[PDB]
A = this chain, B = another copy of it.
Amino acid sequence: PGSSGLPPEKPKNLSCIVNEGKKMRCEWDGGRETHLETNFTLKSEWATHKFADCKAKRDTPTSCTVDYSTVYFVNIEVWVEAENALGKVTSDHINFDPVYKVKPNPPHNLSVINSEELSSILKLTWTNPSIKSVIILKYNIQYRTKDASTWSQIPPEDTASTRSSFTVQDLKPFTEYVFRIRCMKEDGKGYWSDWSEEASGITYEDRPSKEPSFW
């Protein structure tokens, strides 16, 4: 109350995100405190329709989750208008197809299995998120020994397209490995999903080495 009122600063850094299966949410920077309880309204519309205004809540004034279901393959015009007693200002408009703003759920049912009888490999199998029918997925597959302090990563160009399994090679024998994987749209337009649950597996003992040692 002792503070001095100010007009709303033009909202900046507007960006939207469609978490898989959830309604679109847009974020922005409201600027400096105006001391006048600025009201933010997320406006959005298709060239063929005007959607319901999204009124940013009290707790989170610089964020809003729309009321309508996401419809991929159609461009939407989005912008935010800030308003208080001293003025009304609108951010710059952004136009995009939500298919390029998806943050998929991480792959699930991640399991590590021994295969080919080799003591230097471990195979990963998993179930891709349902969004795979809307976008082609690319991944980041990471692995490390149980005792390792850091994660190693499979060359992203080797996991650049939708798949549900991957064989990691050149691993140490009789060693426990932990794995994790994340995904996003293949073209890099969108957001990486959170890391999947970690899954572990143990490589076979090296028979040839045990033989050559006994000999």
Contacts and interface: CB of A to CB of B under 8 A. Distances in A.
A155 B187 CA distance: 10
Interface stretch (A117-125, A135-143, A204-212): A135-143
A73 B155 contact: no
Nearest to A72: B188
Contact of A135 (B72, B74, B155, B161): B155
B138 A73 contact: yes
Interface string A52-77: 00000000000000000111111000
Given A73-B138, A99-B157, 20 more contacts: A69-B189, A70-B188, A71-B187, A71-B188, A72-B156, A72-B157, A72-B160, A73-B156, A73-B157, A73-B160, A74-B187, A132-B153, A133-B156, A134-B156, A134-B188, A135-B156, A135-B157, A136-B155, A150-B163, A155-B186
